Amino acid sequence: CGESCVFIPCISTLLGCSCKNKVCYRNGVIP
């Protein structure tokens, strides 16, 4: 997604951006 949940949780969580490896990805593994 281009998001980073290093300090705070993803904002586009609504879309599907899940916090993974401190990096936010959507659809499982889409940055």
The encoded tokens of residue 9 equal 């949780």
Ramachandran class of 5: left when φ > 0, alpha when ψ lies in -120 to 50, beta otherwise:
alpha
Please give the DSSP secondary-structure letter assigned to residue 27: T
Structure determination technique employed:
NMR
Through-space distance between the first and last CA atoms of the chain, rounded to whole angstroms: 4
- Count other Cβ atoms within 10 Å, centred on residue 26: 17
Assign 29 to helix, strand or coil: coil
